[PDB]
Design a protein around this nucleic acid. Structure first.
Ligand SMILES: [Mg+2]
Ligand SMILES: [Mg+2]
Ligand SMILES: [Mg+2]
Ligand SMILES: [Mg+2]
Ligand SMILES: [Mg+2]
Ligand SMILES: [Mg+2]
Ligand SMILES: [Mg+2]
Ligand SMILES: [Mg+2]
Ligand SMILES: [Mg+2]
Ligand SMILES: [Mg+2]
Ligand SMILES: [Mg+2]
Ligand SMILES: [Mg+2]
Ligand SMILES: [Mg+2]
Ligand SMILES: [Mg+2]
Ligand SMILES: [Mg+2]
Ligand SMILES: [Mg+2]
Ligand SMILES: [Mg+2]
Ligand SMILES: [Mg+2]
Ligand SMILES: [Mg+2]
Ligand SMILES: [Mg+2]
Ligand SMILES: [Mg+2]
Ligand SMILES: [Mg+2]
Ligand SMILES: [Mg+2]
Ligand SMILES: [Mg+2]
Ligand SMILES: [Mg+2]
Ligand SMILES: [Mg+2]
Ligand SMILES: [Mg+2]
Ligand SMILES: [Mg+2]
Ligand SMILES: [Mg+2]
Ligand SMILES: [Mg+2]
Ligand SMILES: [Mg+2]
Ligand SMILES: [Mg+2]
Ligand SMILES: [Mg+2]
Ligand SMILES: [Mg+2]
Ligand SMILES: [Mg+2]
Ligand SMILES: [Mg+2]
Ligand SMILES: [Mg+2]
Ligand SMILES: [Mg+2]
Ligand SMILES: [Mg+2]
Ligand SMILES: [Mg+2]
Ligand SMILES: [Mg+2]
Ligand SMILES: [Mg+2]
Ligand SMILES: [Zn+2]
Lengths: 165, 55, 100, 25
RNA sequence: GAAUCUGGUCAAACUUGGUCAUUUAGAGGAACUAAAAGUCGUAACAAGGUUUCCGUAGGUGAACCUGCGGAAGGAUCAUUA
RNA sequence: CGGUUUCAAGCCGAUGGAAGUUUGAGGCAAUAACAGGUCUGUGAUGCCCUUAGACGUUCUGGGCCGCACGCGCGCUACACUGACGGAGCCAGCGAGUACAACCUUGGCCGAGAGGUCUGGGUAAUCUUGUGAAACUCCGUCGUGCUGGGGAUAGAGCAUUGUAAUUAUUGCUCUUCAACGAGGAAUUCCUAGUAAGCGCAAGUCAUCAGCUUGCGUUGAUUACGUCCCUGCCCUUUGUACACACC
RNA sequence: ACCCACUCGGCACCUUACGAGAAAUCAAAGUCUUUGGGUUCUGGGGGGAGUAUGGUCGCAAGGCUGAAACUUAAAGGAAUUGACGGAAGGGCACCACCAGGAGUGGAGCCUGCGGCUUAAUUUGACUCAACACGGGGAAACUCACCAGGUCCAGACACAAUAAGGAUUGACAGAUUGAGAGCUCUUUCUUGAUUUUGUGGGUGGUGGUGCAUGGCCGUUCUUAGUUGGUGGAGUGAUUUGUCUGC
RNA sequence: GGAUAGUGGCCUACCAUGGUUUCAACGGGUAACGGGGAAUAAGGGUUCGAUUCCGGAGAGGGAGCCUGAGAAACGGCUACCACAUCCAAGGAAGGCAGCAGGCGCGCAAAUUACCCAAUCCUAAUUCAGGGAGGUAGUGACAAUAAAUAACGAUACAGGGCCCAUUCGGGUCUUGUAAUUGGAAUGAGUACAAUGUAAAUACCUUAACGAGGAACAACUGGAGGGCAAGUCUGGUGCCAGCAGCCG
């Protein structure tokens, strides 16, 4: 079980959260003379099919970002987030008027050159300070193309090295 | 698990507050006496670490 | 495998590598030494004649000769039936001609 | 396998090896 | 009695090759070894069901087989006249 | 006693003798084992099962018995050495109830099966001479799937049990199938044995083709050999020793 | 041409070995831990490998010469006892065969076990040594199988209700196969026995006879088994337990 | 003959054809500086020797040379290569395989400390200097020496026993108790004086400095090889140990 959970079929990657069954399981037993080998990857070919036949829409990062913005400027942070699949969780109004924060979920998939997009928008204003938070699910089917998760999957398996699916 | 499963899976018993076995010569003084001077009981042959008499 | 025998092939001692003789049955070339050279002095007529032949015959006393097949056998071929007869380790030292 | 043939085996293996190294002069 | 300077000489090093040694990428090939244990047979060991072997030729799907010669480590220390 | 045999161990033939096959038969039966079989004889049992929706227990109905079809013990026959009637008519092992319901004579009823009254018996006493069968005698049919052979069937009459259809068994009449001595194969057997015949207890409330006992009738043919099969030693070989899977 | 005795040269056996040797054996393989006559050569676990390479030689095949990396705990040798052998002799036994009998296999029918089928047709046992066996001839019981219901037979320990009831019972019809209080309809009984949990057990014809005991079966009722000295061997062992009859 | 301090195929001319070799010439390798020695340790040996002494080499390479008795010096110079410094771009300066330090490499190795007082060395030299050399620091490279309590008493048990009508005193000697009690001790600090170039540390002590909580021994092992667990909980062919067996 520990693999396929560490090394799944669809992605070529781990995780989560898999029941997974089990019923019945016909042995004979024996002595055997059985896996560790036979049962050591019988489960693997099983848990792949249990993964596959369900659905898996696939999960993703997402790094909480909390930026020390000024008020008179830094609307542009919002446009930077709206771009990236981002959800602002909060907009904490500080006692000092020229300081703010914007606690926000941001996928790490989409946060490459994040600061670069932030800097140009804000005009070098507001200081990113992001951190990891929590896994967020996607809506894309993996086998089916033209989907956010599926495109990521096809790219990820090409980075590992096939077979397709 | 498949990586140091047993090391975790045991109940750790704690080091009991038992008295200091003496060091250097006084340690020898035990072992001299616990073989030569005291002389342990023997049914047939001599034995240096006994068992509680059972199967 | 140590020596079964001291002789082995037998005649050959002080004598490089002698000539061989085709066996009788198998036609198995065997040295004329390893050969099991039995002598088959058989009558020209089988015992259960012989009367019958002498009854119908001309003359008296008659030739009544004996054919002289000096046989050979490839040891294996011999064991399968013939004089050989797998002896005991201690008995294998005996060279005495058997019977008699 | 029988040692005479294990000898014969490695005789061919040589004669193949001779054609291989002769293919590059 | 300076720089300067004409031959020599020692000869670094470079240049552009040639050559030995040691290293080291190398597509490919062809091996050999470990093996969870799978196919195909079952060669050898019992006269292992064509006795094994060796040398050496040929052939094969693999063990292997088949000539020739040899050896028993043979399945025989034995047939007398 | 006689031969016979290094005139040993013994074997073979006569005599007598109840007995001359270890007198006949069993009973026990060594070393070492086998991964034989038994966790469904077991409050004999280790540990995995389970432990109240119990895989515990208990009721109630089924099911083990179903049938294209494979083999395996068995029974009945393929008849005239018989079948069917009568008649004659001789055994042995056994077994059997009082707190239950056993064996159950004798008498009446019923073609039967089976009822009923009554007994005798806790048993060399009664059942029981268990007058069992096959047998022996006189008749019917004579070698025709015939009176051989009884299977399949229908209906009833009984009996056990709370309950009988998936006939429990018995009896009644009817049905009359296959099968004219069985191929390849292979089982069992050497004397009161085989083969025939029945009895008998065992299980059983009820069921006998079953079984462990019993007695009746009683041969054929060896009284040897290693041809097959198996086993055993012995010598030999063995790269085997979880031992030719 | 022999006989007989002894002799130089050649080729091999017998017995004891007191000498060697791991032993088989060997009068050389002796005169070697009591280690030294002279000389040449070869070997240093197994494999990888007589391979790779390089020579060198060959018409070539091939030879001579000759590696390591890597790999591995054994590879051997000799013998001992086993087991086994489509090796050879010598036995035994109607579970072998002859000389015969009775048969079975065919026929029908019982009754085992397959196979199929089924809701279940419960399972064990599969050459002798599973297959009319489980004492197993099952109408329910037996009964383990299936369809359905019932019961606690939940020992003891600790706690939550502790009588303003802990819980037990319950005719009537629907309910239910059903004079099962099985319950839902009911509103009367019952008095701390228990019931709800958590430890813990108890039972289980559950599982595994390849975790075991006992009993059995089977090798085999075959004739095998063992030791004590004494010998032979360093030794495992062996001889005793054997040519014959 | 030439050169050299000098001998010489050291170099040059002319001449001769020698020279070495299976008693291994020549070639190659060396994770080779030689020797003294080291470890091992019956005898014979094997392997190691970069390294405290003695030779030899080298100062990034390879050359060439000045001065000088002595240099083919490199804490001299000239150059070329290799590496690199400092720049006002014209040009300058270099050579830790001295000491210390750092990088780098690597499994792998110390402080840019205090001194000439010793040891010696050098000079124009009693007088100066000396990372030669010494002094500490760091230092489990090695090696040497040895604390981790000792003596009581009372309190509970083992051993001798005057005698063993049953005991038991226990007159005599040993072991166990968070009893308790007196008597030391440098591990440390610290006036001092030692020590010392100055200090440290050592040896020596004024003054304090032990009572189980302190002023505390770890490492490995505990089936065999091979000394020693069939103890208590887990674990359950796994995880692991195991030189080998396992
Ligand atoms: Mg051998
Ligand atoms: Mg052999
Ligand atoms: Mg000759
Ligand atoms: Mg010759
Ligand atoms: Mg010049
Ligand atoms: Mg043959
Ligand atoms: Mg074969
Ligand atoms: Mg063969
Ligand atoms: Mg060999
Ligand atoms: Mg008897
Ligand atoms: Mg068994
Ligand atoms: Mg049980
Ligand atoms: Mg049945
Ligand atoms: Mg029977
Ligand atoms: Mg009677
Ligand atoms: Mg008829
Ligand atoms: Mg038998
Ligand atoms: Mg080797
Ligand atoms: Mg029956
Ligand atoms: Mg019945
Ligand atoms: Mg029971
Ligand atoms: Mg003895
Ligand atoms: Mg014996
Ligand atoms: Mg001169
Ligand atoms: Mg060097
Ligand atoms: Mg050296
Ligand atoms: Mg040196
Ligand atoms: Mg060096
Ligand atoms: Mg020096
Ligand atoms: Mg340098
Ligand atoms: Mg220089
Ligand atoms: Mg210098
Ligand atoms: Mg220098
Ligand atoms: Mg330095
Ligand atoms: Mg060091
Ligand atoms: Mg120094
Ligand atoms: Mg220090
Ligand atoms: Mg001290
Ligand atoms: Mg320890
Ligand atoms: Mg331990
Ligand atoms: Mg030990
Ligand atoms: Mg350990
Ligand atoms: Zn022949």
């Amino acid at each position: 079980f520990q693999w396929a959970t560490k090394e799944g079929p669809i992605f070529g990657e781990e995780m989560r959260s898999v029941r997974v069954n089990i019923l019945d399981v016909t042995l004979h037993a024996d002595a055997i003379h059985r896996g560790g080998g036979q049962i050591i990857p019988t489960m693997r070919r099983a848990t792949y099919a249990g993964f596959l036949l369900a659905d898996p829409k696939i999960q993703e990062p997402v790094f909480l970002v909390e930026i020390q913005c000024p008020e008179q400027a830094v609307g542009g942070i919002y446009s930077v987030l709206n771009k990236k699949r981002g959800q602002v969780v909060s907009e904490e109004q500080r006692p000092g008027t020229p300081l703010f924060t914007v606690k926000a979920y941001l996928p790490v998939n989409e946060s490459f050159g994040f600061t670069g997009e932030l800097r140009q928008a804000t005009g070098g204003q507001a200081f990113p300070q992001m951190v990891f938070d929590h896994w967020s699910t996607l809506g894309s089917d993996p086998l089916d193309p033209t989907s956010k998760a599926g495109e990521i999957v096809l790219a990820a398996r090409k980075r590992h090295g096939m077979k397709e699916e | 698990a498949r990586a140091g499963k047993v090391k975790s899976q045991t109940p750790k018993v704690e080091k009991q507050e038992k008295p200091k076995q003496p060091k250097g010569r006084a340690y020898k003084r035990l072992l001299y006496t616990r073989r030569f001077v005291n002389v342990t009981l023997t049914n047939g042959k001599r034995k240096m670490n006994p068992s509680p008499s059972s199967q | 495998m140590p020596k079964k025998r001291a002789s082995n092939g037998r005649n050959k001692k002080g004598r490089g590598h002698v000539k061989p003789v085709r066996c009788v049955n198998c036609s198995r070339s065997v040295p004329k030494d390893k050969a099991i050279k039995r002598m088959a002095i058989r009558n020209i007529v089988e015992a259960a004649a012989i009367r019958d032949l002498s009854e119908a015959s001309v003359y008296a006393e008659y030739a009544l000769p004996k054919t002289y097949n000096k046989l050979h056998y490839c040891i294996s071929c011999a064991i399968h039936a013939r004089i050989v007869r797998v002896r005991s380790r201690t008995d294998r030292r005996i060279r005495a001609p058997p019977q008699r | 396998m029988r040692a005479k043939w294990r000898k014969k085996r490695t005789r061919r293996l040589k004669r193949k090896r001779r054609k291989v190294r002769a293919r590059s002069k």
